[PDB]
Amino acid sequence: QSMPEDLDALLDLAARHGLDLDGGTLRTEEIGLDFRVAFARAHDGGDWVLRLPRRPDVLERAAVEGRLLAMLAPHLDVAVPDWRISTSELIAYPLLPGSPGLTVAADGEVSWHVDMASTVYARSLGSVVAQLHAVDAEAAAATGIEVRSPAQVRGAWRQDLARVGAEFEIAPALRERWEAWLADDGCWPGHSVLTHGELYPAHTLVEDERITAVLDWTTAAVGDPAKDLMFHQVSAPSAIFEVALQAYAEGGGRPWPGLARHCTEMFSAAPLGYGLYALATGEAAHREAAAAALNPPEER
Numbered sequence: 001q002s003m004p005e006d007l008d009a010l011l012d013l014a015a016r017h018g019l020d021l022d023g024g025t026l027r028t029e030e031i032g033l034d035f036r037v038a039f040a041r042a043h044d045g046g047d048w049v050l051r052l053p054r055r056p057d058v059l060e061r062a063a064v065e066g067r068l069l070a071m072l073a074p075h076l077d078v079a080v081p082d083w084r085i086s087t088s089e090l091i092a093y094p095l096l097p098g099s100p101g102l103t104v105a106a107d108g109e110v111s112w113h114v115d116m117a118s119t120v121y122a123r124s125l126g127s128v129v130a131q132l133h134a135v136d137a138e139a140a141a142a143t144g145i146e147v148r149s150p151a152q153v154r155g156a157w158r159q160d161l162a163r164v165g166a167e168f169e170i171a172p173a174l175r176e177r178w179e180a181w182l183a184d185d186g187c188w189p190g191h192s193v194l195t196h197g198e199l200y201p202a203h204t205l206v207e208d209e210r211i212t213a214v215l216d217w218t219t220a221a222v223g224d225p226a227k228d229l230m231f232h233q234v235s236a237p238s239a240i241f242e243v244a245l246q247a248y249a250e251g252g253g254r255p256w257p258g259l260a261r262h263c264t265e266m267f268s269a270a271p272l273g274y275g276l277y278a279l280a281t282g283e284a285a286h287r288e289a290a291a292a293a294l295n296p297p298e299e300r
C-alpha cells in the first residue's frame with residue numbers, strides 16, 4: 001500500500017488512545033467504503049491494524065462485531081481479531097499471523113494462495129467450522145446478530161424470492177430452479193448454528209495450507225450451517241468436499257444427506273442477494289446490476 005500524507009494526524013489519533021506507532025512503518029488502505037484502514041508497527045515492535053470509521057452510521061455494525069469477537073475468541077483454536085481499542089474514532093487490534101488465502105489487487109485482479117483441491121485445507125476448514133458451529137447459540141444471540149430458526153431460514157428465502165420477484169423481472173429458468181430448491185425438503189437444515197456467512201479464502205489466513213485465522217465477522221448470524229460450507233462445495237472437487245464433511249462431523253458437526261445439493265442451489269441464488277441489496281440501498285447502479293443477474297440476456 002501507500003505512505004499517507006496525513007501521517008501526523010494518524011499518529012496523534014493512535015497516541016491519544018495509548019498506541020505509540022513508528023510512523024516510518026505506517027501504510028494505509030483507502031479503498032474501503034465504511035472504514036479507512038492503516039497498518040503500522042508499534043514502538044515495542046508489534047504489528048497493528050487500525051480501522052477508522054468513515055461515518056457514525058457504521059458504528060452499529062462495528063459494535064455487534066466487537067461483541068461477537070469478544071465472546072467467540074475463547075471457543076476457537078484459530079485466531080480472530082482482538083480489539084484492544086474500540087471507540088467512535090478508532091478500532092485497533094494486533095495483526096494476525098499468516099497470509100490471506102485469496103487477495104484482490106487494486107485493479108481487481110484476484111490471486112489464490114491455496115488450492116481448493118487441497119486435502120489439507122479441506123480438513124482445516126471442516127475442523128474450524130465444526131468449532132464455530134459448536135458455539136453456544138444463546139450467547140451468540142446476545143451479541144445482537146440475526147437469529148433464524150430452521151423454519152425461519154427456509155421462510156426467509158421464500159419471502160426473499162417473493163420480494164425480489166415483486167421489484168425485478170426474473171428469468172423463468174432461474175425462478176423455476178429456485179422454486180424447486182425451496183420445495184425440496186431434502187435440501188434444508190433441521191438445526192441452526194452460529195455461522196460466519198462468507199467463509200471463502202479471502203476471509204481466512206493460511207499457513208502451510210491450514211487456516212490460522214478467520215476475519216471479517218460482520219455477516220455472522222445464527223442460522224443455516226451450510227452457509228459456511230457452501231463456498232468450499234462449489235469450488236472443490238466433490239471428493240475434497242467430502243474430506244471437509246468428514247472433518248466437520250469429526251468435530252461435532254451434523255451434516256444432512258442433501259447438504260451438498262443445497263450448497264450449489266444456494267450459491268445459484270446469489271442474484272436474489274443482489275436484488276435484496278439493491279432494495280436496501282435504493283441506488284440505481286445496484287438495481288441495474290441485480291437486474292442483469294436476475295434476467296440475463298439470451299445467447300447469441
Ligand SMILES: CC[C@H]1OC(=O)[C@H](C)[C@@H](O[C@H]2C[C@@](C)(OC)[C@@H](O)[C@H](C)O2)[C@H](C)[C@@H](O[C@@H]2O[C@H](C)C[C@H](N(C)C)[C@H]2O)[C@](C)(O)C[C@@H](C)CN(C)[C@H](C)[C@@H](O)[C@]1(C)O
Binds near residue numbers: 022041043045046
Ligand atoms: C533497520 C533499522 C531499524 O530497525 C528496524 O526497523 C527493526 C524493525 C528493528 O531492528 C532490527 C534490527 C536489529 C539488527 O537492530 C537494529 C536487531 O537487533 C533488532 C532486534 O531488530 C527495530 C529495533 C524495532 O524493534 C524490534 O522490532 C521487532 C519486530 C521486534 C523486536 N522485539 C520487540 C522482539 C523489537 O526490538 C523497532 C520497533 O523499530 C525499535 C524502535 C523503538 C526504534 N526504531 C524506530 C528504529 C529507529 C528503527 O527504525 C531502526 C533501528 O532504524
Ligand SMILES: CC[C@H]1OC(=O)[C@H](C)[C@@H](O[C@H]2C[C@@](C)(OC)[C@@H](O)[C@H](C)O2)[C@H](C)[C@@H](O[C@@H]2O[C@H](C)C[C@H](N(C)C)[C@H]2O)[C@](C)(O)C[C@@H](C)CN(C)[C@H](C)[C@@H](O)[C@]1(C)O
Binds near residue numbers: 231
Ligand atoms: C466466492 C468467490 C466470489 O465471491 C462471492 O461470490 C461473494 C460471496 C459475493 O457475494 C455473493 C453473495 C451475496 C449474498 O452477497 C453477500 C449476494 O448478494 C451477492 C450478489 O453475491 C461477492 C462478495 C459480491 O459482493 C457483494 O455484492 C453484494 C451485492 C453486496 C455485498 N456488500 C456490498 C454488502 C458485496 O460484498 C460480488 C458482487 O461478487 C463482489 C464483486 C464485485 C466481485 N466478484 C465478481 C468476485 C470476483 C466473486 O465472484 C468471487 C470473489 O470470485
Ligand SMILES: [Cl-]
Binds near residue numbers: 032035
Ligand atoms: Cl470498509
Ligand SMILES: [Cl-]
Binds near residue numbers: 061145
Ligand atoms: Cl450486524
Ligand SMILES: [Cl-]
Binds near residue numbers: 120123
Ligand atoms: Cl493435517
Ligand SMILES: [Cl-]
Binds near residue numbers: 148153222223224227
Ligand atoms: Cl441462514
